[PDB]
Ligand binder design. Structure first.
Ligand code: MG
Length: 195
């Protein structure tokens, strides 16, 4: 009897495009961008600041570039949330409590909130009871920490929580804590889970 849902961000909701990102980075002067990915892991845990991140990018980049240029290229990894997934979220809150559990960074998070979640009258606030972000939490999937940490703050029973995330390891760890999981494939429309 599932009462709650935990949803990942990437692939599951927002389409990703590594090639594009790589290319945009190269265009702005980062030659070995693809070997490079450090600060990414730190950023993800919010152990540094967007400021220091850009500096790190510049620093290993060997050139001075605009923060906008950098945010631009970094955000090009994100494509879009097909709007039918947004409908699905809203429809789902009718029968469940719905949380986001996402490994991400402030720069990305602000892009998705401005550019991807806004739909009709709705805003990121409208889809989730609460969003748990790695870089705010300071811990990241698949640390067991983060899963236990989420249920306690949320005050939800793990036995009654369904976790949807396209990373196997993340799912296996969540299962250990008693959570049920589905691992969607790239591009998968996982709406079939509720037919
Ligand atoms: Mg993923």
């Amino acid at each position: 009897g599932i009462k709650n849902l935990l949803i990942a961000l990437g692939g599951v909701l927002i389409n990703l495009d590594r090639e594009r990102c790589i290319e945009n980075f190269k265009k702005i002067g980062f030659q070995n961008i693809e070997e490079k990915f450090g600060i990414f892991l730190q950023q993800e845990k919010g152990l540094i600041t967007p400021a220091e991140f850009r500096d790190g990018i510049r620093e290993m980049m060997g050139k001075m570039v605009s923060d906008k240029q950098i945010d631009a290229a970094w955000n090009s990894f994100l494509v879009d949330i097909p709007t039918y997934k947004l409908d699905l979220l809203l429809k789902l809150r009718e029968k469940y409590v719905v949380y986001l559990l996402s490994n991400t960074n402030d720069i990305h998070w602000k892009w998705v909130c401005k550019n991807a979640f806004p739909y009709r009258t709705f805003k990121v606030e409208d889809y989730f009871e609460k969003t748990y972000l790695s870089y705010e939490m300071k811990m990241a999937k698949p640390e067991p920490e983060i899963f236990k940490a989420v249920t306690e703050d949320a005050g939800i029973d793990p036995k009654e929580t369904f976790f949807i995330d396209d990373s196997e390891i993340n799912c296996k760890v969540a299962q250990e804590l008693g959570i049920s999981t589905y691992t969607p494939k790239a591009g998968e429309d996982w709406s079939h889970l509720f037919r």
